[model samples]
Target: MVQPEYRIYEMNKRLQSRTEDSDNLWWDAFATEFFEDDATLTLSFCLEDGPKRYTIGRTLIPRYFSTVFEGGVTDLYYILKHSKESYHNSSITVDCDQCAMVTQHGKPMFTKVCTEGRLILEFTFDDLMRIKTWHFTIRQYRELVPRSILAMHAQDPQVLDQLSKNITRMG
Candidate 1:
């Protein structure tokens, strides 16, 4: 899915605070690192949007490249662990991004952002992941729009929700 771009207000501020206050750890590493993962990444510097593959402990981590901010490409990896046995299919872009892209099961994930540094994060499950839970609402659907918005940028019409909605499947 194509991930849409967003303002870097929160990201830039983090970089600014770290640079000005000499809190180099925030500049180099996360404070508590709850929202951040510790997985080692192998990256590629390319000029297109498609799969550039890599590996982590024999698990295939397919990366798609896109210019996230102005000067740098935000690497969208295939396997992003939001929880144990739960993965976020997402692609992230940032100006001075915190976690530049998110993906679960090879699909993009949405973000709820903030300016000041914080540790805790909230996870919202969808119908695919809601197997162990039951409940749906308009608010939840509304909350899902951003990720949908982000996915629309993938250059796929299906991702854009522009496909014919009335097509009937013949079996």
Candidate 2:
């Protein structure tokens, strides 16, 4: 269950706006509406000056929609909520989190990251999912995300299925 080189959230430019208020309805509109399924959300602080860099991104992926979640669909928010949780931080584990997402191939993939520096997500409807979460420095983000993304684009479905069955869900 390999994901595309880019996550679905990458499609929406407005959702990535740094100054976009969290209280704005667009936030909910993006998460709960536009992408309700295999979606990714990113947050960041862009500097027009272009020097000191500081930003964040979040990714969400729903495993199954069983007519229970927000819109009668169960969605797994495979969150990549990062603020200051990059590898730069001493607490790497604390800075990272993870979850499983079924991809288009009908396999579940695991994504691990954090809820601090940036957030990333992936949501698939049927069964296949692949969203990996990694922590790197600002410079690394530019180089790593693209490369990592490419790898995700081509993954193994059986591996994903094996992974998905290993984890136990808690409500």
lDDT of 2 by residue, 22-87 (tens): 343444444444343333333344458654533233332221222113232222233333322222
Q: Positional deviation of 32 in candidate 1, in angstroms?
A: 4.4
Clashes of 2: 36
lDDT of each: 0.26, 0.32
lDDT of 1 at 92: 28
lDDT of residue 22 for candidate 1: 38
